[PDB]
Amino acid sequence: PHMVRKQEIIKVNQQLIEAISNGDFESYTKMCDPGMTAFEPEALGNLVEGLDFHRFYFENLWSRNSKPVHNTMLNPHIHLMGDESACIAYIRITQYLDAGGIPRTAQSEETRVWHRRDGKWQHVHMHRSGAPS
């Protein structure tokens, strides 16, 4: 019952990335535990509370973005720890266009930890290295 339960983790994580790409902070907040933590390049090597720090990027950038972007989770690896917690790690490739309209690509590595709280998977901790995008 793992191959399908892994597909459950892949689904909820891909929906989270879709919310980030579109700038939908409301769905982002629902899917994230209020006390989620984050390591990311924008945090300058510090561990921050995930939902307060990221609201600045949603409210001033990602809600305003209208440019075409394509995100690819390359060969995701999923660790199941029982039935109420999961860890997913993957290379995130982002395709976009610059100001000049010429195509560019950025890579980052993302770890995201999920916890089933009241039958809903909640994002509890993330670690991103690589490109800030």
Ligand X SMILES: O=C(O)Cc1cn2nc(-c3ccc(Cl)cc3)ccc2n1
Q: Which residues bind a second copy (CB under 8 A)?
A: 35-37, 39, 41-49, 52-53, 55-57, 59-61, 63, 68, 70, 72, 74-75, 77, 79, 81-85, 87, 89-91, 93, 95, 97, 99-103, 105-107, 109, 111, 113, 115-116, 124-125, 127, 129-130, 133
Nearer to a second copy, 24 or 127 (CB): 127
31 binds, among a second copy, ligand X, none (CB under 5 to 8 A by kind): none
Secondary structure of the chain as H, E, C letters: CHHHHHHHHHHHHHHHHHHHHHCCHHHHHHHEEEEEEEECHHHCCCCEEHHHHHHHHHHHHHCCCCCCEEEEEEEEEEEECCCCEEEEEEEEEEEEECCCCCEEEEEEEEEEEEEEECCEEEEEEEEEEECCC
Interaction of residue 39 with ligand X, rule CB under 6 A: no
User: Which residues form the interface with ligand X (CB under 6 A)?
Assistant: 20, 23, 38, 40, 54, 57-58, 61-62, 64-65, 67, 69, 92, 94, 96, 98-99, 106, 108, 126, 131, 133
